[model samples]
Every structure is written in structure tokens, then in C-alpha cells.
Target: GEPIAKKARSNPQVYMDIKIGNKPAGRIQMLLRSDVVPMTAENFRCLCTHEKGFGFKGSSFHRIIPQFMCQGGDFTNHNGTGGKSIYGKKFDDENFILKHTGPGLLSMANSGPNTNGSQFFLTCDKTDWLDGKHVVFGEVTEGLDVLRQIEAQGSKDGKPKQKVIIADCGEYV
Candidate 1:
């Protein structure tokens, strides 16, 4: 049984809704591991805004591989080439114990070490091979079907056929 003191929760889990087109594809209910991956999570959360005018609103999920992952959040070029953070530059990695165990696992996309920026990816299936290389910040709690829809549109060149854009992202509630 749970204790009386443990019944109350202090910190609220953050959630983000990634809209594919005019409507929301699904919501990503996540727990920011600030205690473990502080810098990476903070950077991601800060860039998940629209009111600030520098969020992932207009970015597209440019690079997607079937049975792999969907890379996105490139606010600068909408391609895999460019992206920036709230700090206006790249930052270091904050690797942790979390594994890319199954589908819907959200993780940061970087060119190499200490190069995390606004770009990120969501796994379409188990990708445990990516462990210790990328930072696992959040996971898609709902709408795996929507992500699959996006993945289905991907071609061999890694470009989406229908153009899945991140219309807006922020706190769910």
C-alpha cells in the first residue's frame, strides 16, 4: 500500500502535443529527468514553445527511417543540416541510464558528442543499439499510430512523402 505522505506529488510531469497538420497527431506525456539529464531536458523544454517565436512550431520531421526512428525539430532549415537551442548554440550531452527499449522512445539527435541542439527523434521500434550515444529525454505515451503514419510516408531518401510538421509544442496542461 502507499503511504499518506507519498500520496501527494510535488513536481508535475510535463507533456507535449506534436501536431502533424491542422490537428494533433497525439500527445507525448513525459517525465523530465532533470535530476539526471538536466541540461538536455531543460534545453528541449525551453525550445518547445510557440509564444516565444523560437519554438518547434514550424519545423518538420525531415529525416525518418522505417523501423528505425523519425528525426525532427529542425527549426532552422527543416532539414537535418541545421538547428539551434534556446542558448543560441550547441550544448554538451547528458547521457543517463534510460535505454531505447521499445517504440515511442524520444531522444536527442546529434551529429556527435557535445552537439545536441533542437533536433530530436522518436523511435518506431526497439533501438537499444543507440544506448549511451543519445540522450533519452522523453517518450511518446500516446499516438504511436500517428507516428507510424508519419513513418509510412517516409521514402528511401529519408524524406517524408506528406511532410509531417511539428505545428506546435508546449505544456499539455
Candidate 2:
């Protein structure tokens, strides 16, 4: 089956202005698949907007594995261990209607089934192994070079040599 495309220009676009250490990294534009995964997409979108009072803005990408993924959104812990959903401490997994087709894909990070919270990841390569296991809800529409810049900072142990922070984030108008 063919991977789904952003249905229309009306669909929401979100962005993250990332930073590596104190230096400014470029922004990543992502198109959320709200048509197929509304709940999951909204969770991320609201988190970006800080509509719930706290969100991704100050969080750091605590886990990075080169050729695998860059994980972050732990606005609570700033590490891989914390962050809660807008709905509650956790929320059920939305349908895995999208696949981890290739690099720059976005998906949720969870501790186990139905445990999705604020944490998420950006794929650095095709991660077919995650297709059925993770809810793929968005993809990078711009700034692949920015993604690579972040990917290059990753180490074998999944930690970046310098802090990778979400300097700012919001609905991209």
C-alpha cells in the first residue's frame, strides 16, 4: 500500500526550532496526519502550542541513536523517563495507520501499550521494524539538513554529545 500524503493545505503544520548546545539549529517543519490520527496529532499539536500550559518548548532530545531515531519531548524530566499527555498521564495508542516508511517520519515514544505521553521521535532512516509497534503521525516537510545536523550529534549510546533542545515550537500558522 502507498503511504498517505498530507491531505490538503488545510491540514495543520507544526514546527520545532532546535538547538544544539547554545548554537541555533534550523527549524523542522512537520505535517501532522490528523486525518488518520486525530488524537495523536492533536496531542502533539497542542503540546507544540503550549495550550495546556506546558509543552515541548524547553525540552531536550534526550535520546539519539544515529541511523535510528532522535527522541525527545520529555518536557517534564528533560530525559527519556518523563512527560505526560495533554489528556492525562498517558493515553491509548491511536491506530497505527501510518508506517515508518523512511527518514524524517515522526512517531510516538511509549513505555508500553497505551502509554503514549508527550514523548516522540524523529526517524533518521527507514525504520520498518516500528510499523506496527509505534503510532506514526507526522513527517518532516522541510529541513532534512537540520535533521541530519541533529543526527550527526548522536552517539552509539543514544546520547548526543551536546544538548539537543527544542528551543521553540508551535503551530506554523
- How close is every model to the real structure, measured as TM-score? 0.81, 0.93
Model 1, 1-173: lDDT tens digits are 85555332222254555555455676565555555566777777777745445867778888888989899887887667888877666887777577889998778898889888889888988898889888887776666777787788677778776767776567545
Query: Which runs of model 1 end up more than 4 angstroms from their true locations?
Result: 1-29, 50-53
Model 2's lDDT to the true fold? Answer: 0.91
Stretch of 10 with least lDDT, candidate 1: 5-14
Give the Å error, residue 72, model 1. Answer: 0.4
Error of 1 at 79 (Å): 2.6
State the weakest 10-residue window (summed lDDT) of model 2: 2-11
- Across 1-173, the per-residue lDDT of candidate 2 in tens digits comes to 87887554346899999999889998999999888898999999999999989899989888899999999999887757999998999999989889999999999998788999999999999999988888999999999999998998899999689998999999977
Q: lDDT winner among the candidates?
A: 2
Superposed on all Cα atoms, the candidates' RMSDs to the truth, in angstroms, are 4.8, 4.2
